[PDB]
Amino acid sequence: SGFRKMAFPSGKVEGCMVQVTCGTTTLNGLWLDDVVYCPRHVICTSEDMLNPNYEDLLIRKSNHNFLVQAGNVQLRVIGHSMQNCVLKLKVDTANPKTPKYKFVRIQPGQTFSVLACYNGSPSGVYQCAMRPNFTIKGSFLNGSCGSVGFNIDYDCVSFCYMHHMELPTGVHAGTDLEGNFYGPFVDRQTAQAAGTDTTITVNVLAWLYAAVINGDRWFLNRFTTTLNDFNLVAMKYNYEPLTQDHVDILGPLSAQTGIAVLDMCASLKELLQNGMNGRTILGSALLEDEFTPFDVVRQCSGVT
């Protein structure tokens, strides 16, 4: 029992982190096989960041201008190319620690673990979610760019995020490992306001199921609702609409607890309308939405 914001073990990803320097800028890179991936803004000076023309800035760079260091040893760069907002630095050495891996582009609501790195060295690991406004609420300081987000399935690391920037509101934006930003964000120092950060309804319901599995049952009520009635309440509270796909995804948690999805929806509806009344659920005074139904099952079953 117990329910924690759990990250995947980060060892497989630590073995991939390198330091990339271009000019005076140092950030992190991800070394898989003989390629080092990093944000293309590594080629920018602070002045460049306001309105960068990446194709033009890249012309002034050669292989020897990208300094890649894995541990305390230097990697030889034999090629460089830009794919969307990431640079792919071809090195002459395959990473001996390359795990089985995939590059995936996640959808909002999906969670992942971040290995926050500085100077190619991992400093910490924490669990994130891709917000419905395509930002992540991370913990990143200067030098953290190139830190990655990932999920692990037994021995296969699915990289889904690469850190690029912090918006003026303190939230974070980045790309998948193909260099495409999540959301409408661009790698430029300009006014980029995030949209409504709505609550991930299916995740809140999954976490309510986790609470019931872990003995926290006070919020369970004698009511039920329909998808349409619940969604009227969800819209009012800036919650994402719940679909039949979400109900189907919650099927196994419903079976494990014996609580029909729509009954749990009615419990959530009363929690939204009445509030917590000073009470807590799984040690939280607010409704947690950064656990997917898959994370609740994985944590409550012990998948390694």
Ligand X SMILES: COc1ccccc1OCCNC(=O)c1cc(=O)[nH]c2ccccc12
- Among 43, 91, 145, 250, interactor with ligand X by CB under 6 A: 145
Phi and psi at 193, nearest 5°, equal -95, 140
- Taking the complex as a whole, the smallest distance from the CB of residue 284 to ligand X amounts, in Å, to 21
Per CB under 6 A, 246 contacts ligand X: no
d(CA 46, CA 178): 24
Catalytic residue among 44, 145, 160, 265: 145
- Among 3, 181, 209, 291, interactor with its own copies by CB under 8 A: 3
Give the type of residue at 74: Q
- Taking the complex as a whole, the smallest distance from the CB of residue 172 to its own copies amounts, in Å, to 7
Q: Which residues in 9-137 belong to E strands, given as ranges?
A: 17-22, 25-32, 35-39, 66-70, 73-75, 77-83, 86-91, 100-103, 111-118, 121-129
Q: How many CB atoms lie within 10 A of CB 145?
A: 25
Active site residue 145: yes
- Partner in contact with 242, chosen from ligand X, its own copies, none, beta carbon below 5 to 8 Å by kind: none
Residues 182-241 that bind ligand X (CB under 6 A): 187-189
Between the alpha carbon of residue 78 and those of residues 34, 36, 66, 92, 138, the distances in Å are: 10, 11, 10, 6, 33
Residue with Cβ nearer ligand X (162 or 281): 162
CA 146, 43, 177 angle in degrees (round to 5)? Answer: 35
Between the alpha carbon of residue 11 and those of residues 149, 233, 278, the distances in Å are: 13, 42, 39
DSSP 277-297: TT--BTTBSS---S--HHHHH
Per CB under 6 A, 26 contacts ligand X: no
Residues 264-293 that bind its own copies (CB under 8 A): 275-276, 278, 280, 283-286
- Among 109, 122, 146, 293, interactor with its own copies by CB under 8 A: 122
- Among 164, 211, 213, 288, interactor with ligand X by CB under 6 A: 164
Per CB under 6 A, 1 contacts ligand X: yes
Per CB under 8 A, 144 contacts its own copies: yes
Which residues sit at the interface with ligand X, rule CB under 6 A?
1, 41, 49, 140-145, 164-166, 172, 187-189
What residues act catalytically? 41, 145
